[PDB]
Amino acid sequence: PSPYVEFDRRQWRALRMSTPLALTEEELVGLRGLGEQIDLLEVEEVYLPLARLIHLQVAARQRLFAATAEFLGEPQQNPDRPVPFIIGVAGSVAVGKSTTARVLQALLARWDHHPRVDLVTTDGFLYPNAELQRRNLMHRKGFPESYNRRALMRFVTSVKSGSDYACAPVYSHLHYDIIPGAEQVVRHPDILILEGLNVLQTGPTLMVSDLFDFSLYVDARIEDIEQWYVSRFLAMRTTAFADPESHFHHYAAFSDSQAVVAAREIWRTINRPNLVENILPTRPRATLVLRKDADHSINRLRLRKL
Amino acid sequence: PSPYVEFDRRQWRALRMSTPLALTEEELVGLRGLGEQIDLLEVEEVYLPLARLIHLQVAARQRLFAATAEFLGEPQQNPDRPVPFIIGVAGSVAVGKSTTARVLQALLARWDHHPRVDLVTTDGFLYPNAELQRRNLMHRKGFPESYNRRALMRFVTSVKSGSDYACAPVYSHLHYDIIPGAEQVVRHPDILILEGLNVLQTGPTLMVSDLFDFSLYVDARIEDIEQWYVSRFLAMRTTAFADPESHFHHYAAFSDSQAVVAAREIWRTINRPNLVENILPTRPRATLVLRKDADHSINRLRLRKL
Ligand SMILES: C[C@H](NC(=O)c1ccccc1Cl)c1nnc(SCCOc2ccc(F)cc2)n1C
Numbered sequence: 025p026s027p028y029v030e031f032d033r034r035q036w037r038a039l040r041m042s043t044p045l046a047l048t049e050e051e052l053v054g055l056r057g058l059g060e061q062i063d064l065l066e067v068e069e070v071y072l073p074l075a076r077l078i079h080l081q082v083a084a085r086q087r088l089f090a091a092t093a094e095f096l097g098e099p100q101q102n103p104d105r106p107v108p109f110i111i112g113v114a115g116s117v118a119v120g121k122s123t124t125a126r127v128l129q130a131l132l133a134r135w136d137h138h139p140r141v142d143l144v145t146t147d148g149f150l151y152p153n154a155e156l157q158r159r160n161l162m163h164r165k166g167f168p169e170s171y172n173r174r175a176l177m178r179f180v181t182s183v184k185s186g187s188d189y190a191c192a193p194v195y196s197h198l199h200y201d202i203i204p205g206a207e208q209v210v211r212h213p214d215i216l217i218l219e220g221l222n223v224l225q226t227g228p229t230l231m232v233s234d235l236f237d238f239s240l241y242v243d244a245r246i247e248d249i250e251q252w253y254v255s256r257f258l259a260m261r262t263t264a265f266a267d268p269e270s271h272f273h274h275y276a277a278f279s280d281s282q283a284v285v286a287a288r289e290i291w292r293t294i295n296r297p298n299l300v301e302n303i304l305p306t307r308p309r310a311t312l313v314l315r316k317d318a319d320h321s322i323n324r325l326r327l328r329k330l
Numbered sequence: 331p332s333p334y335v336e337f338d339r340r341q342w343r344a345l346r347m348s349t350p351l352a353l354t355e356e357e358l359v360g361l362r363g364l365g366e367q368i369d370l371l372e373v374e375e376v377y378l379p380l381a382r383l384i385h386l387q388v389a390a391r392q393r394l395f396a397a398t399a400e401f402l403g404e405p406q407q408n409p410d411r412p413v414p415f416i417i418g419v420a421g422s423v424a425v426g427k428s429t430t431a432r433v434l435q436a437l438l439a440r441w442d443h444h445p446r447v448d449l450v451t452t453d454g455f456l457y458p459n460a461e462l463q464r465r466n467l468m469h470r471k472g473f474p475e476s477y478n479r480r481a482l483m484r485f486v487t488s489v490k491s492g493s494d495y496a497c498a499p500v501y502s503h504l505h506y507d508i509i510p511g512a513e514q515v516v517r518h519p520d521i522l523i524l525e526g527l528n529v530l531q532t533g534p535t536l537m538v539s540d541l542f543d544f545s546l547y548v549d550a551r552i553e554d555i556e557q558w559y560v561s562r563f564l565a566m567r568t569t570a571f572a573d574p575e576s577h578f579h580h581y582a583a584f585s586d587s588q589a590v591v592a593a594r595e596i597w598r599t600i601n602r603p604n605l606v607e608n609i610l611p612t613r614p615r616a617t618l619v620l621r622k623d624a625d626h627s628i629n630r631l632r633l634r635k636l
Pocket residue numbers: 117118147165166221252253254256257260272290294295
């Protein structure tokens with residue numbers, strides 16, 4: 025016995041799933057602009073059922089708010105509307121948290137119950153490079169201490185407080201740094217998806233996950249994430265690294281053979297460590313673990329028994 | 331800018347609760363049974379609405395389970411019933427956690443949605459004074475490491491796994507130790523309350539709070555809890571301390587003056603520090619904070635905005 029209900033891809037395909045849920049032509053090729061590492065199959069066959077499943081929780085949490093308000097007799101101090109339902113997304117660098125996160129925002133915004141759905145990345149809560157350096161933490165970017173955990177708690181707390189506004193800084197992957205003065209504004213969305221390596225990490229007191237209504241962990245065999253890591257790094261040689269303004273411009277010149285050694289090394293000494301010490305252990309804290317194949321196909325879903 | 335809805339005693343009484351709630355004849359005879367001097371006005375004026383609030387959430391969870399199970403097409407590997415709804419109850423030693431848990435237990439069971447409510451104290455998961463001696467831990471009974479956490483976790487995991495059967499040890503306050511062979515059994519109650527100092531404390535990975543659906547933190551000013559603590563101690567001279575077998579027999583002969591000194595020193599050195607260091611920081615992790623006045627009456631409810 026286990027606290028999980030477990031499905032594999034076969035079992036997931038045997039769908040007696042009681043609603044069609046009609047994916048229109050527009051969104052079905054608009055769900056292209058955000059991925060490459062998602063078939064339209066995966067969307068139709070997995071992500072769409074998942075988002076239905078989350079809908080039921082968002083909807084239920086909205087009814088509960090109301091039935092509570094009307095029970096308290098709609099007092100002055102109680103808010104008018106439910107607070108933002110907040111979804112955490114966790115997993116290793118290279119696992120596709122951003123993509124999964126972008127697919128969910130896309131799908132979940134489709135119901136009328138919750139049409140406004142924001143997406144925030146904890147990237148923007150890394151300490152600026154000045155700070156990391158002042159703190160001797162450059163070698164540890166991505167590690168828990170590498171973030172302003174307090175600012176991040178203030179932000180999420182402010183959002184779960186039903187604030188009309190709340191903003192988070194913006195990180196730049198091209199410049200490998202926080203963009204100065206740059207800020208995303210969150211405006212009491214219906215649902216906020218919060219994505220980052222760290223979102224399900226533990227703390228001595230309150231932690232961001234205490235404010236999550238639901239959370240996902242994107243999982244894969246560790247060799248398979250390494251394989252995606254490398255390939256993204258070689259591809260960046262063309263894109264991000266090519267740009268002369270990139271912190272890692274000098275990495276563009278490297279040949280396939282050379283960039284692979286460099287990548288396996290950055291993995292081996294930074295990112296694989298972070299994964300093993302700090303990300304993996306948060307795995308069983310998620311409402312839903314999604315394991316992926318070598319080929320980026322969900323082979324296993326683990327859902328918290330209700 | 332707060333995540334809490336906040337009532338005081340006045341405000342709470344005054345609320346118009348548009349379904350009348352009243353206790354039968356018949357229900358007040360039993361709440362005199364656990365009648366540790368406990369104010370029945372308060373039971374009716376506070377804990378009973380408090381308990382309806384919580385019923386509303388039990389009921390939401392049950393209906394969500396149904397919705398989820400239906401949307402899935404009732405697959406075999408899904409449980410056919412909601413797994414137990416788990417409620418934590420945390421706070422200092424001497425704060426009334428158990429009395430609070432005991433009343434909630436009793437009040438929550440009146441609904442036909444969840445008549446089967448169980449109550450387990452984390453005390454039974456303390457290490458025997460035997461095993462505690464081996465660790466040099468006797469000076470820290472009721473600090474985090476004084477507990478068998480793997481065991482606590484396995485136990486709460488099994489109940490939450492929707493299991494038919496799960497056993498917990500039993501602690502004796504009379505003998506200051508775990509009663510060997512003694513065990514409490516839980517057979518998948520509709521609702522399990524889990525009472526104890528440590529229930530909302532944080533671990534590095536999956537932790538018991540990760541499995542709670544609601545949690546209460548029973549709170550009061552520090553000086554007041556000392557007062558109740560001391561009183562309790564003196565008051566135990568007459569009772570459990572009198573037995574010439576009980577581990578604290580000797581204390582049943584200290585004069586008021588002597589026993590107050592000893593109690594204050596025991597607080598000042600073990601329990602007040604345990605409160606400041608390990609119990610008090612878990613307070614914001616609770617869905618509901620109930621604060622008490624010097625005279626044991628509730629004067630503040632902070633509930634988490636839904
Ligand atoms: C250790 C460092 N970590 C990060 O940049 C980072 C930190 C927090 C969150 C996300 C990231 Cl990607 C890093 N990891 N790989 C590199 S090479 C520069 C960026 O290259 C890649 C390569 C492959 C990826 F999947 C993502 C980024 N670097 C500088």
